Amino acid sequence: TVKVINDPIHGHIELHPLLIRIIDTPQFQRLRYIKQLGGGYYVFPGASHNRFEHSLGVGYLAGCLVRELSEKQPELQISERDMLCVQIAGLCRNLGHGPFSHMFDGRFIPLARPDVKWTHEQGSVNMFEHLVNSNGLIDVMEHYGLIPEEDIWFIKEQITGPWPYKGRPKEKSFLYEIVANKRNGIDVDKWDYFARDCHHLGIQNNFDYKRFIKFARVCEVDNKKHICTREKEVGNLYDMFHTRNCLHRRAYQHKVGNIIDTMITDAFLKADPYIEITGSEGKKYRISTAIDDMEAFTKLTDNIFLEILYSTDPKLDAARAILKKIECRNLYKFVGETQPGRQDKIKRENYESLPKGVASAFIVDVINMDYGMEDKNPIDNVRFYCKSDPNKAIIITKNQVSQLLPERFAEQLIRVYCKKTDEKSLFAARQHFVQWCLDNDFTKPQDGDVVAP
Amino acid sequence: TVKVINDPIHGHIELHPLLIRIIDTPQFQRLRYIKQLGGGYYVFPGASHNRFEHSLGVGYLAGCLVRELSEKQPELQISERDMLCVQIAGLCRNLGHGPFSHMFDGRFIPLARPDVKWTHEQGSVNMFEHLVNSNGLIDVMEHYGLIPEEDIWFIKEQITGWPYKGRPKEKSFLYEIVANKRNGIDVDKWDYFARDCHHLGIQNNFDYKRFIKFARVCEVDNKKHICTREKEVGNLYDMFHTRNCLHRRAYQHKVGNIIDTMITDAFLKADPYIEITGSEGKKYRISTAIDDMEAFTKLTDNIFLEILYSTDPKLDAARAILKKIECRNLYKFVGETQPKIKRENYESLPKGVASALKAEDFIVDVINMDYGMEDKNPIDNVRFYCKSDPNKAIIITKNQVSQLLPERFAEQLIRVYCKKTDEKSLFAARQHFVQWCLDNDFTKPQDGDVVAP
Amino acid sequence: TVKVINDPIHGHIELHPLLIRIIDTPQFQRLRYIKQLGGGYYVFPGASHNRFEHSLGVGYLAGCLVRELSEKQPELQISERDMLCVQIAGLCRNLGHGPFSHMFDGRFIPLARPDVKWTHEQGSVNMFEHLVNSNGLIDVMEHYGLIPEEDIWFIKEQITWPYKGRPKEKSFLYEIVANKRNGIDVDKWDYFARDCHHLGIQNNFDYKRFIKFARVCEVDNKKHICTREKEVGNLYDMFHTRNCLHRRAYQHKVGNIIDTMITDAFLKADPYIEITGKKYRISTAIDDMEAFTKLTDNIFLEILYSTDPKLDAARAILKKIECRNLYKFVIVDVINMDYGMEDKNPIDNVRFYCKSDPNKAIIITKNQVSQLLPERFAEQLIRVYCK
Amino acid sequence: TVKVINDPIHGHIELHPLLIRIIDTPQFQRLRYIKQLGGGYYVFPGASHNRFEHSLGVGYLAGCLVRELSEKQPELQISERDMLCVQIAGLCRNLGHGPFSHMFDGRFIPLARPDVKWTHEQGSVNMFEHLVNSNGLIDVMEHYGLIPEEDIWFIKEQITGWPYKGRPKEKSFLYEIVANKRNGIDVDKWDYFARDCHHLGIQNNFDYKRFIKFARVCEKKHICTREKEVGNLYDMFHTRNCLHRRAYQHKVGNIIDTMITDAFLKADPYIEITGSEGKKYRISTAIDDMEAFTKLTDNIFLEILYSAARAILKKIECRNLYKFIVDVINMDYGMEDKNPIDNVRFYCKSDPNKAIIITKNQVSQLLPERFAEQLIRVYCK
Ligand SMILES: Nc1nc2c(ncn2[C@H]2C[C@H](O)[C@@H](COP(=O)(O)OP(=O)(O)OP(=O)(O)O)O2)c(=O)[nH]1
Ligand SMILES: Nc1nc2c(ncn2[C@H]2C[C@H](O)[C@@H](COP(=O)(O)OP(=O)(O)OP(=O)(O)O)O2)c(=O)[nH]1
Ligand SMILES: Nc1nc2c(ncn2[C@H]2C[C@H](O)[C@@H](COP(=O)(O)OP(=O)(O)OP(=O)(O)O)O2)c(=O)[nH]1
Ligand SMILES: Nc1nc2c(ncn2[C@H]2C[C@H](O)[C@@H](COP(=O)(O)OP(=O)(O)OP(=O)(O)O)O2)c(=O)[nH]1
Ligand SMILES: Nc1nc2c(ncn2[C@H]2C[C@H](O)[C@@H](COP(=O)(O)OP(=O)(O)OP(=O)(O)O)O2)c(=O)[nH]1
Ligand SMILES: Nc1nc2c(ncn2[C@H]2C[C@H](O)[C@@H](COP(=O)(O)OP(=O)(O)OP(=O)(O)O)O2)c(=O)[nH]1
Ligand SMILES: Nc1nc2c(ncn2[C@H]2C[C@H](O)[C@@H](COP(=O)(O)OP(=O)(O)OP(=O)(O)O)O2)c(=O)[nH]1
Ligand SMILES: Nc1nc2c(ncn2[C@H]2C[C@H](O)[C@@H](COP(=O)(O)OP(=O)(O)OP(=O)(O)O)O2)c(=O)[nH]1
Ligand SMILES: Nc1nc2c(ncn2[C@H]2C[C@H](O)[C@@H](COP(=O)(O)OP(=O)(O)OP(=O)(O)O)O2)c(=O)[nH]1
Ligand SMILES: Nc1nc2c(ncn2[C@H]2C[C@H](O)[C@@H](COP(=O)(O)OP(=O)(O)OP(=O)(O)O)O2)c(=O)[nH]1
Ligand SMILES: Nc1nc2c(ncn2[C@H]2C[C@H](O)[C@@H](COP(=O)(O)OP(=O)(O)OP(=O)(O)O)O2)c(=O)[nH]1
Ligand SMILES: Nc1nc2c(ncn2[C@H]2C[C@H](O)[C@@H](COP(=O)(O)OP(=O)(O)OP(=O)(O)O)O2)c(=O)[nH]1
Ligand SMILES: [Mg+2]
Ligand SMILES: [Mg+2]
C-alpha cells in the first residue's frame, strides 16, 4: 500500500510500497541523526533539519521530473520500473554522509586520512549495498517488478557514475541527469535543499523548480539524448547558480559557522584514537576508520558529538575541552577575510604552511566558491529548444543572455582566525593579517583601514 | 553588546548581553538536543526543531509584549529591570524538559517513579538555579542593573507560580506574560503555534501580532490584568481552537503517541543499566537523574542512540524495542473511542479489554483534550475593554459571543493498540475493542460497522 | 497548444488550448473588473484581487480533483473529455457575478426589483451561453472532442434522475464544481487560500490533503465522492474556516456598511445610468447578457466622475465613502452565518471509508467525532447603522 | 486617534491620526484605481494590486526606519515632527502616477506631448499641494505639531529634491529614506520587492528587516550599514534587476502597455475630463490641472471599451495581440552606467562612527563587470 508523508516543503508526497521498504531500515533511518548543515545550526537556530527529510524530498522531486518526461514524451518509452529506480536513487543519494554532513568528508576525513579517496557519493552506494543485503530487499525488488542486478547497477550509477554505463542503454542516457547531473549540476538534489535550507534558516530562495519542470524536455544533441529546457528560461538557470552561490556566502560558508566546524573536527581528531565503534563481526573502529565497514558507519552519526561531551574518560578530556569551548561560546576570534588571484590561488598541498606565513608578516581556512563545474560555466553545458522546433536544441552563450552576468565563475576566499581571545592578541593578530595581505599582494580587507592604518 | 539571531519564525531578534550569557551555558545549550515534539518527528519529518529554538522565541515574544505595555501605558512604570526579568523567564521557561519533551514528564517519570511529583516547571527553576550558580552570573545580573535576591524569585515565579513576593501586586500583570496561570494566554503558546506549524506543515489560525496590538492593562477587582479589546474575543476562542487542532492533528497522533510509548517502554527496561554522572561524581539512572542538575544537564535525546548502539548484553530488551521502531514494527492501532477515567484507573483498562490475547497484549492511551483549564472556559477569566472607556474591564460571556462555540470544554479520547500484529490477532483485537465499548457504554468507533459487523 | 499561467496561489497551472479560447472572450475577461470581496478592499487593503483570477483557480482545482480520480480509479470510465467539461464549469462558475459581487446579487437587486429572483448561478449559465455563442466556439468544442448538446447541458447543470448532462453512473462529477449535497466543492478551496493570502488572514484547511484521500464509493446504489475516516475532523475545520472568513472579513461591520452605501448610490443612480441595441439600466442589465458584459465595478467610478445633476444624490454618497464619512455603527443588517445548508449539518451528508474495505461508505455522526463541536450550525446576527 | 490596518505584506500597521486624514481624501483614494504593475496584470493574474496599498507600505517602512534611528542614536536629535514628515513623504511619493502607472509617464505622455517634461514626482508634489488645499489640512497639520511652511517644503523635497530649504544639512540623512538620490536604497524599493513578489508569484531575495537592524548615521551625514551587509546590497539591486526581467519588462506584458498607449493616443481627440471650473481636459492634458488628474485613473480604459480606439482594446481582450513596433528597454542598477554601491559607506564593529568605502573587488569577483545594458524587442502588428 502507498503511504503519504506531510512535508513543510512539498506537502503530501506519495511513496511506493517498495520505497517504504527502503526507508524503514536502520541504514536509512540513520539519517535522522545527521544534520544537513552541520555546524550551521549553532549560528542559524532554525537549521535543525537532518539528512532524512532531505532524502525524502530528493526522492519525491526525482519522481516528479521523471514522470513529467514520460507523460509529455511517451516516445521515450519510460517504464514504471525506470521511474521507481529513479526514485530509489533520489532517496539513497544521501546515504553516505557522515557526522554533521560536509564536515566529515570535507574536513575530518581529509585531515585524518590524507591519502584515502572518499566522498559521500561513494558512501551512498557502499551504504546502499549494505542496506539491500542486510534487509533482504533483493526478493522485495523482484516482487515489485525490478530486475536486481541491472537495476542495482542503474541506481548506483545515478549516485556516483561509472558509453561507460552498465545499468541502462545509452538510448536512455537522460535518466542520469535527474538525481546527480555530472554534466551541468541541474539535478533534483539542488532544488530540494534550496527550498528546505531557506525554509529552515530563514533566508530567501531565487529559483522556482516547478516552473523548470513544466518546461523540461529530452532532446538529441551530439548523437546523445540530454535533458533540455526552453530558451526563455535561460535567465533563471543563471539565477539558480546565483541562488546556490548566495546560499553559500550567507550560511554554508559563514565564518562563525565554519570556525565551529573546524573546532568539531579538531575535537574529533583528538577523540579519534580512543572512540571505539563496534562494526561488523564484532570488530572495533575509530571515527576515521568506520567508513571502511558499513555496519560500523551505520552507527556513526552526530551522537559522536554528545558521546565526547557527556564523557568521563580521561583520554577524551582534550576533545571534551574543545566542545566545552563551543557550548560556552568561547570561539576562535575571526580576524579578517581576503582573496587571492585566479593565478595566485593557493593549492591544497600548501594549506599546512599558511599560519606560519601570517605569523611572519592562528587558523586559516580556504574556501573555493565556484558554480559547480570548477572554473567553467555550467550553462554552456545546457541545450535549449524553441517553441517552433522542440527537437532542435541550440546553444545559448553567456554573452547572448546579459551583459551583467559574472565575468568569472570561480573564486577563492581566505578566512583567518586567532585562538587567543586577548584584546591585545586580537589587535596584534589583526595587524599581522593586514600586512600579510599587502605582502602577498592579496585584496584589501573590508575592515582594513579601521583595525590597522 | 547585543547580538542578533535570525529565526525562520520571527526574523532578526535582538538579545540583551545578559540574555546572551544566559544561553551560552551548557544547561541552556543542552536544549539543542531535546526534540520539541518528541516522537512526532517519526510521523511529521519536518518536526526536527528542538527546545532551544523554541526558548528564544518565547523570550523574544515575552519582550515584545512587555515592551508594548511599557510604551503604551507609562502609568504602569515598567522598568528596564522588569522587562529584562520577563525575557529571562521566557528563555528559561523550558529548561526543565527531559528527553523527547512531554514524553519524559508525562510518561516515563510517572511509571519509573510514581511516588514523586515532578513537572518541567519544577525542573526549569531547579535548572535555572544551577545555571546561574555554575556559571557565576549573579554578579553579571548585578552588572546589568538587577537585584538578584528579588529578581531571581521573580524569574522563578513567572515559570512555576497575594502569593508572589518577587514583584508587588501593583505589577501583577507581569505574571500573565510568560506563563499565564489565570487563563493560559501567554507568549509560550504563540511561539509553538507558529513554530510547530512551520515545521509540521500544518496551518495556524491565530495571529499574535494582532493580539499584542490591542493588549492593555486595566484595573478590575482592584487588581491589574492584561486585557484586549471587545473585538478580539472571537480570535481568542480560535486560539484555543487552534491549540486543539495542533493537538488533534500532530501532538496526539495515534502513531506518534505509540512511538512515544515504545521509547518509554525501552527507557524503563534500560533505566537500571545506564548511569548518568554528575554532582560530586555520583552515578544516576534515567529516572533518578532528575534529582541532580549536573546529571540532568547531560540527560537529553542522546539516551535514545546510546541504547541503540549499546554493546551491553544487559540492554537487549531495551535495544529490541528501539529497533522495532527503526524497522517500524510498531504496535497496531485498533480503534479510538470516548466515554471521565481517573488517572489512577489507567493501569486497569488493559485487563478490561481482554475480558470483553492476554492483558499485556493491549495498550490503552487516554488523552485529555481540553482548553487549558480542565472543564472551565478560559475566556470567562478574560476581561475586555471597549473603545469608549478603555479603562473599564467588562466581561463577555459565551452566549454574547456566539452560539456556535463548543458546548463543553473538556473531553477524553481512548486509543487501543495491540502488541500482536498478525492478521488473526488484529482481528480479535478489533472484536474485543468494539465489545469493550458496549460493556462500558462508550462512543461508537468510526470504523466499527465495517471492521466488526 | 498549451499555455501555463503563474498564479500566486497554485503556482504554474497548465490550461488546455480550448480553455484558453474561452478565457480570451469579452465575457470572461470582464471579470478582471469585479472585485472578489467587493467592499472588503476598503477595509482590508490587500484584497484587490478580482473575479478573473479566482476563476482560473476553481477550474485548475477542478482538473486536479477529476484527474486524481481517474488515475486512482480507471473503473469509472472518466474520459479525457469528462475532465475537460468539469474544468469548463469551474472556470464559468463565476461569470454571473455583478458589480462588487455579493453587493449586487445580495442586496442591490433584492431591493431594486423584488419581483425577480436572481442568482449568480443563473447569471453564469446565461453569460456562459452568451459566451459560447458570441464567440462562435461551439465550433471549437467539437474540435477538441466534445458533443455540445449534451456537454453544454452537463456544464450548466454543474453550475445550477434529474440531470440530463450525464447518467447516474457519472453522478460524482456533479460534486466537484458546485456541490449541492454537502458543499465540499473546489470553489471553496480556492477562495479559502486566495482570500487569506490577499486579506492577510490564516487559512486552516489543507485541500491538497483532502484530494489525496478522495475516492468515489457506491452508497445507496449511487456513486458519491468520499474521504477517509481520519479526515472528518478536517472537514469540520473546513466550515470552521469558512465561518472565520465571514466573521473576520466577509461580514466585517464596516465592510458591510460600505457595501450598503454603494447599493444606495446605485439605487438613486438606477434610472439615470444608461447601459447600451437598446439601452439598459444597472437594474435591468441582468436581462440582457450583452449589457451585463459592460456592467462591472466601473459603474462605481462612472457615477463618481459624472457631472449630470440627476446623479447628484448618488454621487454625494460615493463622496461620503472616499472621505470615510460612513454610517456610524449603532439601515439594519441581518446576517445568517450557517454551514452552507441552513440549519443542517453538512457532515451528515458526507460518507467515509476505511482501509479494511475502501468500498464501504459509512456515515459518521457528530457525537462520534468530538464532543467539543458546535451545538447548532446556523445562527442569526442583527446590526443597526445610523444613516 | 490611531488606526490599525491589516496588510498581507507588513501585517498590522499603525497610522497617526494625521496620516488617516491624508488617506481619507479623494486625491489619495484615487490610487485605489491605478494598478501598480499596469499591463503585467494581463500576463501575471495575481498582480492586481494598486498604488494605494503600495503607498501605505512605503510610509510604514519610512516610519520604521526613521523610528529605528531615533531609538539607537539620540545624538541625532530626531523629533516626532521629523518622523511625521517622513511618513507623509512615504505615503505621498506615489500620488502623481497616472493610469496604469508607468505606461502613462513612460510611453504615453512622451508620445502624446513630446514637448512636455512630466514625471510622477512632479505630479506627486503637485497633487500633494492639491490634497492639503482641497481638504483644508493646513490647520490640522499645525494642530498635530507641524510647522506647515517649513515642513511641507521638506515633504515635497523628500520626493523631488546644502540646497535644501526644509531641513538643515545637520539632518541630511532623512532625505535618504523616502527617495534616495545618492544610491537608491530607499524604503519605496523595499515595499514593491515584497508586494510585487507576493502577488506576481515571484521570489524575493532581499531582507529589508535585516538591513534596518544594521543602519547607522555617520559623518555631511549619510545612512550606512555594517561591512557584512555589502553582499546583501548587490543582491538587492540584483533582486530587482531580476524583477524587471520576469515581470516589469515581460515581452507580452510590455506589448500590452504599448497597445494601450496607441488606444489612448487614438482616444485623445475625444477624451473629455472636467477640471478646475468645468473646463474640459483630455487624457494628455489632465496633468496640467490636478482637479482633472484626480479623476484620471484606469477608468478611462473601460470608458473607451464600453463606448477606432475601441478596436485595439477589443484586440487585447480577445488576445489578438501583436506577435513577438520596436521597444527599447534600459536595464540599469538605477544610476545609469554608474555603480550604486560606490556611493554607500560602511562601518565596522570596531569604530561604529568611522565610515569606510568598500569596492567591488573587495566583495567578490562573481559580480557584474558593467552595470547597464539595453535590450531591443521587435513585434509584428
Ligand atoms: N497537513 C496534514 N498532515 C497530517 C494530518 N494528519 C496526519 N498528518 C500527516 C502525518 C503523516 O506524515 C502523514 C500521514 O499521516 P496519516 O495520519 O494521514 O496516516 P496514518 O498512517 O497515521 O493512518 P493510516 O495508516 O492511514 O490508517 O500526514 C493533517 O491533519 N494535516
Ligand atoms: N552567542 C551565540 N550566538 C548564536 C547562537 N545561536 C545562533 N547564534 C548566532 C548569533 C551571532 O551573531 C552569530 C555569531 O556568533 P558569535 O557572535 O557568538 O561569534 P563571533 O565570531 O561573531 O564573535 P563575537 O561574540 O560577536 O565578538 O551566532 C547562540 O546560541 N549563542
Ligand atoms: N554548513 C555547510 N554545508 C555545506 C557545505 N558544502 C555543502 N553543504 C551543504 C549545503 C546543502 O544543504 C547540501 C548540499 O550538499 P550535498 O552533499 O547534499 O550534495 P552536493 O555535494 O552534490 O551539492 P552541489 O551539487 O555541489 O550543490 O550540504 C559547507 O561547506 N558547509
Ligand atoms: N536573513 C539573514 N541572516 C544572516 C545573514 N548572515 C548571517 N545571518 C544570520 C545568522 C545569525 O543567526 C545571525 C547573525 O549573523 P551575523 O553574521 O550577522 O553576526 P556575526 O556575529 O557572525 O558577525 P559580527 O560579529 O556582528 O561581525 O543572522 C544574512 O545574510 N541574511
Ligand atoms: N512508514 C513510515 N511512515 C512515516 C515515516 N516518517 C513519517 N511518517 C508518516 C507516514 C505514515 O502514514 C504515518 C504513520 O506511520 P505508519 O503508517 O507506519 O503507522 P501505522 O500504524 O498506521 O502502520 P500502517 O499504516 O498500518 O502500515 O507517519 C517513516 O519513516 N516510515
Ligand atoms: N508530541 C507531543 N507534544 C506535546 C504534547 N503535549 C504538549 N506538547 C508539545 C506541544 C507544544 O509544542 C509544546 C507545548 O507544551 P509545553 O509543556 O512546552 O507548554 P505548556 O505546559 O504551557 O502547555 P500549554 O501551553 O498549556 O498547551 O509541547 C504531547 O502529548 N505529545
Ligand atoms: N515564476 C515565474 N513566472 C514567469 C516568469 N516569466 C514569466 N512568467 C509567468 C507569467 C505567465 O503567467 C506565465 C507564463 O509566462 P511565459 O513568459 O513563460 O509565457 P509566454 O506566453 O509569454 O512565452 P511563450 O509564448 O511560450 O514564448 O509565467 C518567471 O521567470 N518566473
Ligand atoms: N479610515 C480608513 N480605514 C481603512 C482604510 N483602508 C483599510 N482600512 C481599515 C482600518 C479601519 O480600522 C478599518 C475600519 O474603518 P474605519 O475605522 O475608518 O470606520 P469605523 O466604523 O471603525 O469608524 P471609526 O473612525 O473607527 O470610529 O478600515 C482607509 O483607507 N481609511
Ligand atoms: N464582502 C462579502 N463577500 C461575500 C459575502 N458572501 C459571500 N461572499 C464572497 C466571499 C467569497 O470570496 C466568495 C464565496 O462565495 P461565492 O460568491 O464565490 O459563491 P458561493 O455562494 O457558492 O460560496 P459558498 O458555497 O456559500 O461558500 O463571495 C458577503 O456577505 N460579503
Ligand atoms: N489579521 C486580522 N485583521 C482583521 C481582523 N478583523 C478585522 N481585521 C483587519 C481589518 C482592518 O484592516 C484592520 C483593522 O480593522 P478592525 O476591524 O480591527 O477595527 P475597526 O476600525 O473596524 O473597528 P473599531 O473602529 O476599532 O471599533 O484589521 C482579524 O481578525 N485578523
Ligand atoms: N508593468 C511595468 N511596471 C514598471 C515598469 N517600470 C517600472 N515599473 C513598476 C515596477 C514597480 O512596481 C514600480 C517601481 O517603480 P516606482 O514607480 O515605484 O518608483 P521608481 O521609478 O523610483 O522605482 P526604482 O527606485 O527605480 O526602483 O514600477 C514597466 O516597464 N512595466
Ligand atoms: N493568452 C493569455 N495569457 C495569459 C492570460 N493571463 C495570464 N496570461 C499569461 C500566459 C501567457 O503565456 C502569457 C503570455 O500571453 P500569450 O501567450 O497569450 O501571448 P504571446 O505573445 O506569448 O502569444 P502565443 O499565444 O504564446 O504565441 O500571459 C490570459 O488571460 N490569456
Ligand atoms: Mg458552493
Ligand atoms: Mg526610487
Side-chain angles (χ1 to χ4, degrees), chain C residues 93 120-121 177-180 183-185 187-188 191 242 340:
Chain C
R93 191 205 200 278
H120 61 83
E121 306 103 52
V177 175
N179 185 333
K180 281 284 201 170
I184 309 177
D185 46 72
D187 182 75
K188 287 198 200 57
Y191 78 74
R242 181 180 174 272

Side-chain angles (χ1 to χ4, degrees), chain B residues 109-116 118-138 140-169 171-218 220 223-264 266-278 280-281 284 286-313 315-339 341 345-346 348-350 352-356 359 361:
Chain B
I109 291 295
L111 283 159
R113 315 243 315 259
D115 54 309
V116 174
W118 162 268
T119 68
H120 66 78
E121 297 84 339
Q122 176 196 345
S124 296
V125 300
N126 282 3
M127 183 59 62
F128 176 71
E129 185 95 331
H130 183 229
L131 195 159
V132 301
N133 291 330
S134 295
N135 297 86
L137 318 173
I138 309 100
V140 192
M141 307 176 68
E142 291 179 8
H143 176 55
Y144 290 109
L146 306 186
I147 306 293
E149 164 61 28
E150 310 172 13
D151 290 345
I152 285 190
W153 289 113
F154 180 43
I155 296 168
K156 287 176 179 160
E157 289 170 346
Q158 301 184 69
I159 293 169
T160 41
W162 184 243
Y164 302 106
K165 75 198 174 196
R167 277 305 180 271
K169 197 181 179 73
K171 304 288 187 59
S172 78
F173 58 92
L174 297 174
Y175 287 87
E176 312 186 2
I177 300 181
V178 173
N180 188 318
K181 290 300 184 301
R182 190 172 183 269
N183 49 45
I185 296 175
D186 43 35
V187 294
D188 183 84
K189 282 188 177 57
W190 301 337
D191 184 81
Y192 83 72
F193 289 171
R195 188 166 306 271
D196 300 342
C197 285
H198 182 83
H199 291 74
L200 296 160
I202 297 306
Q203 295 183 111
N204 172 30
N205 193 36
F206 175 71
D207 185 3
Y208 69 92
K209 287 174 238 55
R210 177 173 171 86
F211 180 93
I212 292 185
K213 267 290 188 294
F214 301 116
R216 164 175 180 92
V217 190
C218 295
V220 54
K223 192 157 59 172
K224 323 226 284 200
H225 291 350
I226 291 179
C227 312
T228 172
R229 199 169 119 196
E230 43 173 288
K231 48 166 105 171
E232 274 287 296
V233 70
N235 293 338
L236 259 55
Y237 271 102
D238 290 343
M239 187 196 112
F240 303 90
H241 180 270
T242 301
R243 177 177 176 277
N244 222 41
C245 292
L246 289 162
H247 271 85
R248 184 235 311 162
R249 259 165 215 184
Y251 310 152
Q252 313 300 324
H253 194 104
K254 56 198 182 308
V255 184
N257 287 5
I258 198 52
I259 290 180
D260 276 327
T261 300
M262 300 173 76
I263 304 173
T264 66
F267 273 17
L268 286 161
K269 319 214 294 195
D271 181 84
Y273 304 107
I274 312 178
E275 298 180 322
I276 295 89
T277 301
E280 64 189 19
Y284 295 83
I286 306 174
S287 47
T288 78
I290 63 175
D291 302 330
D292 171 44
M293 298 310 104
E294 291 234 337
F296 192 71
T297 297
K298 317 192 293 157
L299 184 101
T300 50
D301 304 346
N302 158 84
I303 294 296
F304 186 92
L305 294 183
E306 263 282 310
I307 294 159
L308 193 77
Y309 305 159
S310 58
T311 83
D312 198 325
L315 285 179
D316 302 34
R319 185 188 305 107
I321 293 182
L322 296 191
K323 290 175 315 226
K324 296 181 69 173
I325 297 174
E326 204 164 32
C327 292
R328 200 157 274 245
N329 179 27
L330 320 171
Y331 312 144
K332 286 279 146 289
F333 167 79
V334 172
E336 193 184 18
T337 183
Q338 301 148 34
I341 284 81
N345 291 324
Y346 284 1
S348 311
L349 298 321
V353 180
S355 303
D361 301 17

Side-chain angles (χ1 to χ4, degrees), chain C residues 6 41-42 45 53 199 296 298, chain D residues 6 32-33 41 200 299 306:
Chain C
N6 189 48
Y41 180 41
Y42 293 86
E53 322 90 16
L199 290 164
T296 48
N298 162 224
Chain D
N6 180 79
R32 289 191 193 253
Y33 320 102
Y41 175 46
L200 295 157
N299 172 84
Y306 300 159

Side-chain angles (χ1 to χ4, degrees), chain A residues 2-7 9-16 20 53 55-61 64 91 196, chain B residues 45, chain C residues 212:
Chain A
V2 154
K3 277 174 151 53
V4 191
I5 304 266
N6 185 249
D7 174 54
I9 307 304
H10 305 305
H12 283 62
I13 68 183
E14 309 185 278
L15 290 194
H16 192 283
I20 292 293
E53 47 266 34
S55 303
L56 304 177
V58 183
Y60 164 77
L61 297 183
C64 289
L91 278 175
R196 157 165 290 104
Chain C
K212 275 297 165 296

Side-chain angles (χ1 to χ4, degrees), chain A residues 5-6 8 24 26 29 32-33 41-42 45 48-50 53 199-201 299 301 303 305 310 327 329, chain B residues 5-6 8 24-25 29 32-33 41-42 45 48-50 53 198-201 300 302 304 309 326-328:
Chain A
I5 304 266
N6 185 249
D24 285 332
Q29 303 279 63
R32 292 169 175 289
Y33 321 98
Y41 176 45
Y42 298 88
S48 65
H49 57 302
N50 301 315
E53 47 266 34
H199 191 254
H200 282 262
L201 304 161
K299 295 139 66 173
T301 56
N303 164 88
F305 181 100
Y310 299 161
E327 301 279 84
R329 214 68 182 191
Chain B
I5 305 269
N6 171 84
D24 283 336
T25 59
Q29 298 286 324
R32 286 190 191 265
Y33 318 104
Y41 181 44
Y42 297 86
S48 66
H49 54 297
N50 305 292
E53 38 259 59
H198 182 83
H199 291 74
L200 296 160
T300 50
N302 158 84
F304 186 92
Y309 305 159
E326 204 164 32
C327 292
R328 200 157 274 245

